[PDB]
Amino acid sequence: RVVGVVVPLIHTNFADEIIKGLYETTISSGYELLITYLDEDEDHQYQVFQTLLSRQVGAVFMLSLDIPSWMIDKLLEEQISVISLTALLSEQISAVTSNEFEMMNSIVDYLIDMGHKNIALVGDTKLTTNISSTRRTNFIKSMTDHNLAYENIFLYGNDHSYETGYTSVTTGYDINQLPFTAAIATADMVGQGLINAMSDHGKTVPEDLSIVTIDGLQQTEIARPKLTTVKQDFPEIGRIAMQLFLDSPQIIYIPTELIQRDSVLNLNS
Amino acid sequence: RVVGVVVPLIHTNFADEIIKGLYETTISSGYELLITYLDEDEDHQYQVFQTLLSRQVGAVFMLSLDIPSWMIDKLLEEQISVISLTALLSEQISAVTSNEFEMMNSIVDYLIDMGHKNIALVGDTKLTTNISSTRRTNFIKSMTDHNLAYENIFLYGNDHSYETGYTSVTTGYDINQLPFTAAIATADMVGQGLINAMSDHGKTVPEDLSIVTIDGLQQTEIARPKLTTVKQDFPEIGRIAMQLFLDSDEPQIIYIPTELIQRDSVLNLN
Numbered sequence: 001r002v003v004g005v006v007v008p009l010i011h012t013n014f015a016d017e018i019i020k021g022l023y024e025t026t027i028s029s030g031y032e033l034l035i036t037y038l039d040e041d042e043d044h045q046y047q048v049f050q051t052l053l054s055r056q057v058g059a060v061f062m063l064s065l066d067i068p069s070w071m072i073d074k075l076l077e078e079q080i081s082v083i084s085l086t087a088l089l090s091e092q093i094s095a096v097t098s099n100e101f102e103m104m105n106s107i108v109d110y111l112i113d114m115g116h117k118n119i120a121l122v123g124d125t126k127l128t129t130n131i132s133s134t135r136r137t138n139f140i141k142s143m144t145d146h147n148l149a150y151e152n153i154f155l156y157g158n159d160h161s162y163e164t165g166y167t168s169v170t171t172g173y174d175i176n177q178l179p180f181t182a183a184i185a186t187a188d189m190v191g192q193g194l195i196n197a198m199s200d201h202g203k204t205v206p207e208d209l210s211i212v213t214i215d216g217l218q219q220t221e222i223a224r225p226k227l228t229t230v231k232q233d234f235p236e237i238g239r240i241a242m243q244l245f246l247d248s249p250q251i252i253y254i255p256t257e258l259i260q261r262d263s264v265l266n267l268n269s
Numbered sequence: 270r271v272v273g274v275v276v277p278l279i280h281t282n283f284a285d286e287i288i289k290g291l292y293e294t295t296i297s298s299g300y301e302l303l304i305t306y307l308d309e310d311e312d313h314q315y316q317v318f319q320t321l322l323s324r325q326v327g328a329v330f331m332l333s334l335d336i337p338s339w340m341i342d343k344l345l346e347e348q349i350s351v352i353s354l355t356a357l358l359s360e361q362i363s364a365v366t367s368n369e370f371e372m373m374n375s376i377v378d379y380l381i382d383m384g385h386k387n388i389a390l391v392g393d394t395k396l397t398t399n400i401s402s403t404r405r406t407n408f409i410k411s412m413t414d415h416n417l418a419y420e421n422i423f424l425y426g427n428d429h430s431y432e433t434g435y436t437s438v439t440t441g442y443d444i445n446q447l448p449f450t451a452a453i454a455t456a457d458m459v460g461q462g463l464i465n466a467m468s469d470h471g472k473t474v475p476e477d478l479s480i481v482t483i484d485g486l487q488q489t490e491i492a493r494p495k496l497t498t499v500k501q502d503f504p505e506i507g508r509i510a511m512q513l514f515l516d517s518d519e520p521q522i523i524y525i526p527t528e529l530i531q532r533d534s535v536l537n538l539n
C-alpha cells in the first residue's frame with residue numbers, strides 16, 4: 001500500500017503544504033507516501049518512472065504541469081491511478097485544484113473596487129509551446145470582462161521567483177514612472193520581490209504600488225507591509241485528492257479566500 | 270540501485286538544499302532517490318521502516334536528530350548503510366555535518382570583536398531527555414572561553430520558528446529594555462522573526478539589536494535588513510554523504526566548511 005508524489009526539482013513552497021495533506025490522509029488509511037523529484041531531463045524522468053513502477057505504487061500524484069505525456073500514459077497502462085494537483089495535466093485523469101479563473105477574477109474585482117484601473121500581472125506570464133499560460137489568459141479575460149482595455153493591462157515575467165518580482169520594476173518598467181498602480185503577483189515570492197525593489201529604491205507599498213499575491217503562504221504574513229493575498233488551501237487539495245483515490249474522471253475545485261491586509265491602496269479614499 | 274532519505278515532517282528549508290546535493294550525486298552514479306517523511310509516532314515510524322527495506326534501499330540518509338535507535342539498528346542489521354547529515358545520530362554510523370562548535374565560536378568571536386558583550390541565543394535552546402542541546406551548550410562554552418560570564422549570557426526558545434524569534438523579544442524579554450545587544454538566531458526564520466518584532470514595536474535592526482543567523486538560506490537575502498549569517502553548504506553535505514556511501518565497502522565524521530557572510534544586521538558598538 002504505497003502511493004507516489006512527483007514534485008518538480010524547482011518548486012514554490014506550496015509542495016510541502018500539499019504533501020502535508022496527502023500525508024495526513026495516507027497515514028490514516030494504511031498507506032505510505034514516497035516522494036520523488038522530477039527535473040527537465042527526459043532520461044532522468046524515465047529512471048524515476050521505473051522507480052514508481054518498481055515500488056508498485058497504487059497511485060501517483062502529479063504537482064508539476066510539466067509532466068511528459070508518455071509518463072502519464074505508461075502509469076495508466078500499468079493500472080496505476082494518476083491524479084494531478086493544482087493543474088489539469090490530462091483529459092485522461094482527475095484533478096484537484098483551486099479554480100484559476102475564480103482566483104484571478106476575485107483579485108481584479110477587488111482591485112477595481114479599490115479604484116485601480118491600470119494593473120500589471122507579474123510573475124509567470126510567458127507563452128509557450130506546450131504549457132497553458134493560465135494566469136496571463138485569465139487576467140486578460142477578467143480585465144476585459146470588467147470593461148478595461150488593452151492600454152490598462154500590463155504583463156511582466158517568466159517565472160514565479162523573487163527575482164522576477166524584483167526585476168519587473170527595475171529592468172522591466174521605470175520605477176519612478178510606473179504605468180500601473182497595482183500588480184498581481186503570480187506567487188508570494190514575486191510579491192516580496194516587488195516590496196523589496198520598491199523599498200530598496202526609496203518607495204513605499206502601497207502608496208507607490210499596490211500588490212496582491214496568489215497562494216497566501218507564510219511569506220505574505222512575514223512581509224512588511226503584510227501582503228493581501230488569495231489563499232489556497234493546499235493541504236485540503238492533498239487530502240481531497242488522496243480521498244478521491246481511496247474512494248475509487250473529474251475536476252474537483254477547492255475554494256480560495258481573498259485576505260485583505262496592508263498592501264493595497266484605496267484610490268477612491 | 271536506490272537510496273532513501275528520511276526527512277522530519279517539521280523542517281527548515283535546509284532539507285531541500287541537502288536533497289539537491291544528494292540528488293546530483295545519485296543521478297551521476299545511476300541511483301534513484303526515495304524521499305520519506307517521519308513524524309513523532311512510533312507506529313508510523315515502523316511503517317516508514319517497512320517501506321525502506323521493502324524498496325531494497327542500499328543506504329538511508331538521516332537528516333533528523335530524532336531517529337529512534339531501533340530504526341538505525343534494524344537497518345544496519347539488514348546490511349543497509351546508514352549515514353546521518355547535519356547531526357551525529359549514533360556512534361555506530363558515519364556523519365557529514367558542519368562543525369557546530371566552529372560555527373558558533375565564529376559568530377561569538379565576530380560579535381565580541383564588534384563590541385558586543387551581552388548576547389542572546391534565540392531559537393532551539395531547550396534541554397531535553399534524549400537530544401543534545403548542541404547550540405545552547407556551544408554558545409555557553411564559547412562565551413565563557415571568551416571570559417564572559419553567566420550574566421552576559423541569555424537564552425530563549427524551543428524551536429527554529431519565526432514565532433520563536435518574534436516572541437523572544439516581545440513576551441520573553443522587555444522589548445523596551447532588552448538586556449542584550451545582539452542575538453544569535455539558530456535558524457534564518459528566527460532572525461526574520463526578530464527583525465519583524467523590532468520593526469513592529471518602533472525599533473530597527475541593527476540600531477536596536479544586532480542579529481546573526483545560522484544556515485544562510487534565501488530568507489537572509491530577502492530580509493530587510495539583509496541578515497549576517499553563517500552559511501552552511503547544504504548541497505555539499507548531501508554530495509559528500511552520498512560519496513561516502515559510494516566509496517565505502519570504520520565510522521567517521523566529515524566536517525564541511527562554513528563561512529560567515531557579513532551583510533546589514535550587525536552594528537559595531539566600539
Ligand SMILES: OC[C@H]1O[C@H](O)[C@H](O)[C@@H](O)[C@@H]1O
Binds near residue numbers: 186214
Ligand atoms: O506557486 C505559484 C503556482 O505554482 C504552480 O503553478 C501551481 O499550480 C499554482 O497553484 C501556484 O499558485
Ligand SMILES: OC[C@H]1O[C@H](O)[C@H](O)[C@@H](O)[C@@H]1O
Binds near residue numbers: 483
Ligand atoms: O535549520 C536549523 C537547523 O536545523 C537542523 O537542526 C540542522 O541540523 C541544523 O544544521 C540547522 O542549522
